[PDB]
Amino acid sequence: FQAPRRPGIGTVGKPIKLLANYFEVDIPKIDVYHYEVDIKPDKCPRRVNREVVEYMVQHFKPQIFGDRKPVYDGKKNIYTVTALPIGNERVDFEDRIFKVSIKWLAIVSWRMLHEALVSGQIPVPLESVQALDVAMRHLASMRYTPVGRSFSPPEGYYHPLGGGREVWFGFHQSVRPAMWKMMLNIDVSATAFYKAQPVIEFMCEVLDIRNIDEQPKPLTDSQRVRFTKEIKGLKVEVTHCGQMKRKYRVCNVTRRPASHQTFPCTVAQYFKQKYNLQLKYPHLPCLQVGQEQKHTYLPLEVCNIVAGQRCIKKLTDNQTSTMIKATARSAPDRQEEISRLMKNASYNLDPYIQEFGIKVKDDMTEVTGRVLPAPILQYGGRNRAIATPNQGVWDMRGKQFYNGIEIKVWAIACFAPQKQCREEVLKNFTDQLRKISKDAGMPIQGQPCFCKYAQGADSVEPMFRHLKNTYSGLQLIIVILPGKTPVYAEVKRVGDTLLGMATQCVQVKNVVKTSPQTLSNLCLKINVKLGGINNILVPHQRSAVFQQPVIFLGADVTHPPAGDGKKPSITAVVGSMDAHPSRYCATVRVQRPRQEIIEDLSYMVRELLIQFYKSTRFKPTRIIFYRDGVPEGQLPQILHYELLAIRDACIKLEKDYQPGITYIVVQKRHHTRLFCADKNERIGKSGNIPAGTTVDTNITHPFEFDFYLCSHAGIQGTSRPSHYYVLWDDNRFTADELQILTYQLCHTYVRCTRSVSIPAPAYYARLVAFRARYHLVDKDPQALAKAVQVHQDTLRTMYFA
RNA sequence: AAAAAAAA
């Protein structure tokens, strides 16, 4: 129903000196008057609203405004430093004619805000916070071009991104609060837009078919679907009508040529009879806009693209790679650019801020974090062979697994053409796999019992059925995939839903180019696919909460992309099954699209508790939850619903059963970066902060429990720390204890020998959600649950890893 | 789809 308060400040670690991109802001403790402005029609854009409001202010001055400069957010609200003498009642004033109206609702004040920030007891007034945020943005909004919360200047785009896409630089601004002061958040950001060239070469570029004169066919008849799905949803800028601005979204496009295009006389004939103009390319198709009764047509040769449109659809791998390469940069360059932008902004010579009386600083804020110690890991075999991570990475050479799994029966399915793998590469592959496995842990034995070529994506089920029927005690199958065929999806579906056998996939390139690191990683995957154990945390160095049985949970919600068909959203929950947290299970299921609530939480938690009891013979006393992917400003309703669902699930299983519950939400999509103050303590070529640095003061909320943590070693660009925010606490933990527990849980990932960003439950929930998304891809609410349900023989293993 | 990080 509420949130806890901070039980002190942690005092374990080694001090560090950092810098954060927060600039202080001062307030004058006055009273500001709140007004409401509404203009019809309601479909007018924000730029036009601002223009008409400014015109009314400037040229209807003596009637209303006397020597006063208001601030307008953009949609409905305006503010003024002094009371407007128009009156307290709803007084309305007055294409080329617009109508406005005035109100007086909710006069706000700032002394209460200052008192709340100086003494952490009462919550911060969102009305005052929004007033300051609106007053701190007016000149930038008026001058620059606003794209969401970005302020990209109109000078300099460059960096073509491939097919009809570009990258625009800018910055992002916010007035997030802090302790004793308000602070301004500045950060460099980049986005993607559409280049504004004529549509003929736009299509030529997107199809890479510039040499089309050699093949003047009316249509390709193979990529027309993708061309239509690309062009659809964009606004045109035809200028043949005299800057008429036919801003009609192109819903439908025909494919017949202008020669065969008939409507009550073709486009060429109508254009001739109207303007006496000849069309150079008649064999091209035509664009259709408006209603069918209107039948307004547009030939492709006299059309353009409007500048200033965002992209929502998916991208391509090479486009993503080149975007990352273009916008990578590094920490010193980022710091220099941030400082240059802040010094160039010159917020102290602005008429509006001068009128209100706000003052802003010039230098970055100083913070003092600390570095937590790293744990140690226990291996098995002939000798213990403990491992000590160094700079977030350790190695496995010379050590054996904790619990090996001998392999006796296995098969191999080839696929791919015989040219790239015929007889020689496979022998070396098998021999090196056997040697590496014998060196490390599981001793693969014998010769493969099956090795055949099965080209064709429709010949998977009969082959797997024959293998299962013929070879008793099958234990593993190896698959080789040529490219990006749907064979991967078909194999996953067949081996998880229908039959229930373990499978492993690998590329041809890594088979014709062997490598010890690749082979070791593949063995790491295979060992836990079969049901073994890789390593466990050393029991001596561990938290004090493990003295009694506990269970760790996690959750995630995945939403459909763009605005395509109403495919269902997917939610998932995972939980541990061992005293040392090394094994997990998943209970994915679907729900109504576009909703940020898990509805079946009670059933999921009841099932997980039943499985935990069946596997451990005990009953959990504490529960730890790690929710991921919560939009800001929608937390209290989510907390209420889930906290009630968890308690109901606990109640229904057994009467008078009530364990403790801890609720934690993680956030990785924000705009806070921490840089290193000294030049003698930069780790790596990119000069990032070391791994395991936490900050808890001077940039965090006054009377709530939260912190920052960076638990991975950056390798490219600049790092991005994660923000944790507890909501409900019932086990009365402590700050250092909880931070150490999270840091230790970051080390349990099983697919690599490196520490990672967010905990293993969060990764596992995301992975099972993505696997379910692959499961749903086939080529009806009743059949969706059956499609997502996985086989009983594989419900118990870690098939997602 | 050997694996982590970096941009939306």
Swiss-Prot record:
Q: Look up the signal peptide feature and give its range.
A: none
Its post-translational modification remark reads: Ubiquitinated on surface-exposed lysines by a SCF-like E3 ubiquitin-protein ligase complex containing ZSWIM8 during target-directed microRNA degradation (TDMD), a process that mediates degradation of microRNAs (miRNAs). Ubiquitination by the SCF-like E3 ubiquitin-protein ligase complex containing ZSWIM8 leads to its subsequent degradation, thereby exposing miRNAs for degradation. ZSWIM8 recognizes and binds AGO1 when it is engaged with a TDMD target.
Q: Where is this region: Interaction with guide RNA?
A: 270-275, 483-525, 669-673, 712-720, 749-774
Effect of changing T316I: reported as: In NEDLBAS; uncertain significance
Per its UniProt entry, which superkingdom is the organism in?
Eukaryota
Quick one: a GO cellular component term? Answer: cytoplasmic ribonucleoprotein granule
Q: What keywords tag this UniProt record?
A: Cytoplasm, Disease variant, Epilepsy, Intellectual disability, Repressor, Ribonucleoprotein, RNA-binding, RNA-mediated gene silencing, Transcription, Transcription regulation, Translation regulation, Ubl conjugation
- For region Impairs access of bound RNA to the active site, the annotated ranges are 631-636
Outcome of substituting P285L = In NEDLBAS; uncertain significance
Q: Which ranges carry the Piwi domain?
A: 476-777
Q: Tell me the protein family, please.
A: Belongs to the argonaute family. Ago subfamily.
The note filed under miscellaneous reads: Lacks RNA cleavage activity due to the absence of the conserved His at position 805, but also because it binds the RNA in a subtly different manner that precludes efficient cleavage.
Disease (UniProt): Neurodevelopmental disorder with language delay and behavioral abnormalities, with or without seizures: An autosomal dominant neurodevelopmental disorder characterized by global developmental delay with intellectual disability of varying severity, speech and motor delay, and behavioral abnormalities, including autistic features. About half of patients develop seizures.
- Explain the purpose of this protein: Required for RNA-mediated gene silencing (RNAi). Binds to short RNAs such as microRNAs (miRNAs) or short interfering RNAs (siRNAs), and represses the translation of mRNAs which are complementary to them. Lacks endonuclease activity and does not appear to cleave target mRNAs. Also required for transcriptional gene silencing (TGS) of promoter regions which are complementary to bound short antigene RNAs (agRNAs).
Name recorded for this polypeptide: Protein argonaute-1
Origin species, per record, is Homo sapiens (Human)
Traced from the root, the source organism's taxonomic lineage reads:
Eukaryota, Metazoa, Chordata, Craniata, Vertebrata
| Gene name for this UniProt entry | AGO1
